[PDB]
Every structure is written in C-alpha cells, then in structure tokens.
Design a protein around this motif. Structure first.
Motif, mmCIF file in Angstrom:
data_model
loop_
_atom_site.group_PDB
_atom_site.id
_atom_site.type_symbol
_atom_site.label_atom_id
_atom_site.label_comp_id
_atom_site.label_asym_id
_atom_site.label_seq_id
_atom_site.Cartn_x
_atom_site.Cartn_y
_atom_site.Cartn_z
ATOM 1 N N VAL A 64 -6.913 -21.470 15.404
ATOM 2 C CA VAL A 64 -7.908 -20.541 14.870
ATOM 3 C C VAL A 64 -7.343 -19.140 15.059
ATOM 4 O O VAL A 64 -7.079 -18.750 16.188
ATOM 5 N N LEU A 65 -7.024 -18.456 13.957
ATOM 6 C CA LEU A 65 -6.356 -17.164 13.923
ATOM 7 C C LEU A 65 -7.353 -16.171 13.346
ATOM 8 O O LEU A 65 -7.857 -16.442 12.270
ATOM 9 N N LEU A 67 -10.379 -23.465 0.782
ATOM 10 C CA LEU A 67 -9.155 -24.120 1.227
ATOM 11 C C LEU A 67 -8.034 -23.096 1.217
ATOM 12 O O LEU A 67 -8.072 -22.152 0.425
ATOM 13 N N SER A 68 -7.036 -23.276 2.103
ATOM 14 C CA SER A 68 -5.914 -22.346 2.210
ATOM 15 C C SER A 68 -5.215 -22.195 0.863
ATOM 16 O O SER A 68 -4.712 -21.125 0.534
ATOM 17 N N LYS A 83 -6.740 -24.384 11.328
ATOM 18 C CA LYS A 83 -6.071 -25.677 11.228
ATOM 19 C C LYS A 83 -7.096 -26.803 11.252
ATOM 20 O O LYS A 83 -8.197 -26.653 11.825
ATOM 21 N N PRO A 84 -6.771 -27.970 10.640
ATOM 22 C CA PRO A 84 -7.748 -29.040 10.466
ATOM 23 C C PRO A 84 -8.406 -29.550 11.759
ATOM 24 O O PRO A 84 -9.568 -29.993 11.770
ATOM 25 N N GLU A 85 -7.705 -29.420 12.892
ATOM 26 C CA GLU A 85 -8.225 -29.901 14.163
ATOM 27 C C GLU A 85 -9.476 -29.125 14.609
ATOM 28 O O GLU A 85 -10.267 -29.678 15.382
ATOM 29 N N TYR A 86 -9.678 -27.912 14.064
ATOM 30 C CA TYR A 86 -10.824 -27.065 14.360
ATOM 31 C C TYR A 86 -11.817 -27.041 13.198
ATOM 32 O O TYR A 86 -12.739 -26.213 13.175
ATOM 33 N N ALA A 87 -11.583 -27.907 12.206
ATOM 34 C CA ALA A 87 -12.411 -27.966 11.019
ATOM 35 C C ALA A 87 -12.840 -29.425 10.759
ATOM 36 O O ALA A 87 -13.708 -29.935 11.484
ATOM 37 N N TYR A 88 -12.245 -30.123 9.761
ATOM 38 C CA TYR A 88 -12.647 -31.469 9.379
ATOM 39 C C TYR A 88 -11.598 -32.554 9.627
ATOM 40 O O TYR A 88 -11.886 -33.716 9.364
ATOM 41 N N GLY A 89 -10.449 -32.197 10.211
ATOM 42 C CA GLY A 89 -9.506 -33.188 10.720
ATOM 43 C C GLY A 89 -8.878 -34.047 9.622
ATOM 44 O O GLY A 89 -8.884 -33.697 8.438
ATOM 45 N N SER A 90 -8.387 -35.222 10.050
ATOM 46 C CA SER A 90 -7.725 -36.172 9.165
ATOM 47 C C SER A 90 -8.714 -36.833 8.213
ATOM 48 O O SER A 90 -8.346 -37.218 7.113
ATOM 49 N N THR A 139 -6.255 -27.020 5.908
ATOM 50 C CA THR A 139 -6.405 -25.704 6.516
ATOM 51 C C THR A 139 -7.427 -24.907 5.714
ATOM 52 O O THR A 139 -7.390 -24.903 4.488
ATOM 53 N N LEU A 140 -8.358 -24.243 6.414
ATOM 54 C CA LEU A 140 -9.414 -23.468 5.786
ATOM 55 C C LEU A 140 -9.258 -21.974 6.098
ATOM 56 O O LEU A 140 -8.751 -21.583 7.137
ATOM 57 N N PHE A 141 -9.796 -21.154 5.200
ATOM 58 C CA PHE A 141 -9.934 -19.731 5.401
ATOM 59 C C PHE A 141 -11.403 -19.348 5.280
ATOM 60 O O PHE A 141 -12.072 -19.796 4.361
ATOM 61 N N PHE A 142 -11.885 -18.474 6.178
ATOM 62 C CA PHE A 142 -13.195 -17.889 5.983
ATOM 63 C C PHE A 142 -13.164 -16.383 6.177
ATOM 64 O O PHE A 142 -12.409 -15.892 6.998
ATOM 65 N N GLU A 143 -14.034 -15.692 5.416
ATOM 66 C CA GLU A 143 -14.481 -14.343 5.694
ATOM 67 C C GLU A 143 -15.924 -14.464 6.168
ATOM 68 O O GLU A 143 -16.721 -15.110 5.489
ATOM 69 N N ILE A 144 -16.201 -13.879 7.336
ATOM 70 C CA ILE A 144 -17.507 -13.958 7.975
ATOM 71 C C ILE A 144 -17.964 -12.545 8.318
ATOM 72 O O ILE A 144 -17.200 -11.767 8.888
#
Ligand SMILES: COc1cc([C@@H](C(=O)N2CCCC[C@H]2C(=O)OCc2cnn(C)c2C)C2CCCCC2)cc(OC)c1OC
Length: 122
Positions: free
Chosen positions: A15-16, A43-44, A90-97, A109-114
């Motif tokens: 998580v960056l 999605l990235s 990264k997927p491990e902090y989102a929805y995984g495999s 891999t996901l991107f968000f603006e919050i």
C-alpha cells in the motif's frame, strides 16, 4: 512508476500513498470512527473505473472494522480531514488471487483517489 510512502506495517510495498492535497487540522480518525469519503477507483491498467461521484453521495464506513478492503482500513487511518490521497494497492491488500469478477480480476493491483470529508466517533 510506483511512487508513495509504504504505509504497510510489514513494509512490503503493498500500500503506497501520496498526499495530493493537504488537509485541514492535524487529526486522523481512530479505529471505530465513522468516516465519510469521496473516492475514485480503478484497476492499475485502467480497465474498470468506479466513483462515489457517480452517485453524488459520500461513501460512509466504520474505520478498522474490515468493512472495506485492508488497504482502505490502513490508508484512511493516515488521512486528515480535507486531505486527498492516492493509494496504489497490491492484491494482498485488496481482493487477492480470488479477485471479485467482473469488476476485479485475479491478483489485480488497484489505484484509488480518496478525499476524507469528515469523521466522527462511534
Ligand atoms: C468488489 O465489488 C466492488 C468493488 C468496488 C470498488 C472497491 O474496491 N471499493 C469500493 C470503495 C471502498 C473500497 C473498495 C471496497 O472495499 O469495496 C468493497 C465494498 C465494501 N462495501 N461496499 C459497499 C463495497 C462495494 C472497485 C475499485 C476498483 C475499480 C472497480 C471497483 C466497487 C463496487 O461497486 C461500487 C463493487 O461491487 C460491489
């Protein structure tokens, strides 16, 4: 480039975070607080996009309760009222495999603006 502060406890770059707009006031929310946000997610690779702006109402949840993906519990906890942040996840902090089709493919891999609008105690 994959930029941002690694805000994971494990320091695995999962998580960056980049602050895009500095907020007002120094306070961040505690676990259990009710948080109100606007967000944009994709999605990235940019192939699916979602926003709270579509429905013109904030997204409201209880922080640190696992109501949302792990990256949000971690990420919103670092934000000030009025702050806008970008998160690369990264997927491990989102929805995984397993993913969550059709919106989220396997190992995405996901991107968000919050935007953190406000928060209040439980
Ligand atoms: C897994 O299912 C969904 C995930 C999301 C979006 C998402 O991943 N979100 C929504 C905002 C909160 C963070 C994160 C999430 O935890 O979503 C699961 C979730 C928890 N409560 N609610 C109402 C949802 C949709 C995702 C973002 C990347 C581009 C595609 C959509 C929105 C969805 O609909 C708005 C959705 O469908 C239920």
């Amino acid at each position: 480039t994959e930029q941002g502060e690694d805000i994971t406890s494990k320091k695995d770059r999962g998580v960056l975070k980049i602050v895009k707009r500095v907020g007002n006031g120094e306070e961040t929310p505690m676990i259990g607080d009710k948080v109100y946000v606007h967000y944009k997610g994709k999605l990235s690779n940019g192939k699916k996009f979602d926003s709270s702006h579509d429905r013109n109402e904030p997204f409201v949840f209880s922080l640190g309760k696992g109501q949302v993906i792990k990256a949000w519990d971690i990420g919103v906890a670092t934000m000030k009222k009025g702050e806008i942040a970008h998160l690369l996840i990264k997927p491990e902090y989102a929805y995984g495999s397993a993913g969550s089709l059709p919106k989220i493919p396997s190992n995405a891999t996901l991107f968000f603006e919050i935007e953190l609008l406000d928060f209040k105690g439980e």
